[PDB]
Amino acid sequence: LAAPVTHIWYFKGVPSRLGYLLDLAPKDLEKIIYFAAYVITSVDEEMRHNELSTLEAEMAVERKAVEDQRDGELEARAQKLEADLAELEAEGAKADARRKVRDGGEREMRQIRDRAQRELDRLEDIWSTFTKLAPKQLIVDENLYRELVDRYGEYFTGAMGAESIQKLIENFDIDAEAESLRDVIRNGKGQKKLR
Amino acid sequence: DRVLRGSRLGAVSYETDRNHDLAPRQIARYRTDNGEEFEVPFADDAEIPGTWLCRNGMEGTLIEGDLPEPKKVKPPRTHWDMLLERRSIEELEELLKERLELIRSRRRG
Amino acid sequence: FGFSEIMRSTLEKDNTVGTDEALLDIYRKLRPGEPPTKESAQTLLENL
Amino acid sequence: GAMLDVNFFDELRIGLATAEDIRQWSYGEVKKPETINYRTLKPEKDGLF
Amino acid sequence: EDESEALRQARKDAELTASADSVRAYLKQIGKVALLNAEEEVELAKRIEAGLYATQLMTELSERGEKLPAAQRRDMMWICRDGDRAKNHLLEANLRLVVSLAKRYTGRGMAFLDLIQEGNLGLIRAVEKFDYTKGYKFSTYATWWIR
Amino acid sequence: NDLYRRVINRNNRLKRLIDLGAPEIIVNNEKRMLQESVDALFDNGRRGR
């Protein structure tokens, strides 16, 4: 085979042995091995640690430049509304028809700041999902994963499919995992102990 | 539904199965480009071929180097040849510099 | 359905107003994975 | 364990086959989706047969 | 409040679904990229030819000659990268043409997605063989190789 | 022979696409098809139609 392929017996039949080994839900495992969602195979820690400070400085700078273009939009809409004031303050018409154009301009300003809120929430979500990055974490929205890849090509590796599953099985310590599991069954109780 | 009678495309011979006097054989040794070696028993009155298709699906050459292995052709259906068969070098050059002017006038004046 | 305690109870518990909103709801419960448009979501039940 | 299947058995152990076991069982790589030549009915080279 | 607000919410909820059939998943994957026109196809073809000549020239020069103009080498690699970007964009534009041609051969012999991927190979060959100097619509030339 | 032929066909086409150089949509669709073929070989009707 020119690309690795998982055995169907160890993934589909309940209980899913790949899911129990890697601690992945079956609906989040089928999405990996049938090419619907990416998966962070590995991540750096200390380079991430100092580049947290440097990259949050760069992120604040980029968001500040976004706010600079946003106040350019604010001032441009203010000058446009003052031009509408100059070209509607001496035209004899109805009391609301001379002001419905200004209300439409203010509605245009309201949707401009709504779009600014939308892109700032997008940038906030990108920074949040970099700051909460870990292995065995699915990333839906290929656009969002693409943005993480082209902005943060270092500090982590991600993949998609049975090659990623093979990489996760390689980066796996059965002895440490078994010590954690036996610690849980010695200490905890309930659903966590049954799991 | 029927009494259908079918045969696979081969015939069974039945002679004696003896193992005391056989035709003489000598073992060649081929090594691939994987660093893995295979042994094949040929006949005595048989010319040893230089390259044998081993059990890995890859061509293994002989382990005793004797042959001037040839200099066979590149597969000539590439995009560069399919471009050259309908274009000219000066046309590609003027298009290259015209495309170069875009990055030069984008990065600088 | 003026006589039916069950029907008026379910109209109290429907948690959905708006014909277009209910139509989008049944479109999402019926067709999974398709981007809903207004005319296709309207004519889906009629064509079905 | 032996695989000639003469009747000297003690066990029958089943495991999980690795790729280096599969390409050690095999006798060659089948690499064409051909079975039998349509006119002469002889098994094709590097096919399934 | 039904002016694309609840429609947008249901659109994102449908975008985050599963869609467990492979044909439906491939159609939803190829539906994202928008279509093109003649001038866009012309400029993509010109970028393809420029990038191909750039990488051919750089290989045949660096085989026997070493030079270091930094800006020139950087823009040469820029041309080589963005030519392949243009080629990938052209293929992803014409995937719907491939599917629309291959949908009429179903039911006899092969599957659906085998037909679609064979049309994909034919489309790659048509993009290789395309010429813009004769000045025609790209679909009329590519239909021959796809079929 | 049909299941083995589908696996061998899709694997050869994938080798052609990878060594040719194709975009990610085509290559990922080919890999998903190869995975579904091997799954249908080992157990038919387990995941999907």
UniProtKB/Swiss-Prot annotation, chain B:
GO molecular function: bacterial-type RNA polymerase core enzyme binding
Any one Gene Ontology BP term: positive regulation of DNA-templated transcription
The keyword Lipid metabolism is assigned to this record: no
Keywords: Transcription, Transcription regulation
Family annotation (Pfam families): RbpA
Family named by the database record: Belongs to the RNA polymerase-binding protein RbpA family.
Assembly and binders: Forms a complex with the RNAP catalytic core and with free principal sigma factors.
Biological role: Binds to RNA polymerase (RNAP), stimulating transcription from principal, but not alternative sigma factor promoters.
Protein name (Swiss-Prot/TrEMBL): RNA polymerase-binding protein RbpA
Organism: Mycobacterium tuberculosis (strain CDC 1551 / Oshkosh)
Name of the encoding gene: rbpA
From Swiss-Prot, chain C:
Function, as annotated: DNA-dependent RNA polymerase catalyzes the transcription of DNA into RNA using the four ribonucleoside triphosphates as substrates.
Family that this chain belongs to: Belongs to the RNA polymerase beta chain family.
Subunit structure comment from the entry: The RNAP catalytic core consists of 2 alpha, 1 beta, 1 beta' and 1 omega subunit. When a sigma factor is associated with the core the holoenzyme is formed, which can initiate transcription.
Protein name: DNA-directed RNA polymerase subunit beta
Source organism per UniProt: Mycobacterium tuberculosis (strain ATCC 25177 / H37Ra)
Lineage of producing organism: Bacteria, Bacillati, Actinomycetota, Actinomycetes, Mycobacteriales
Gene symbol of the encoding locus: rpoB
Included stretch of the parent chain: 251 to 298 of 1177
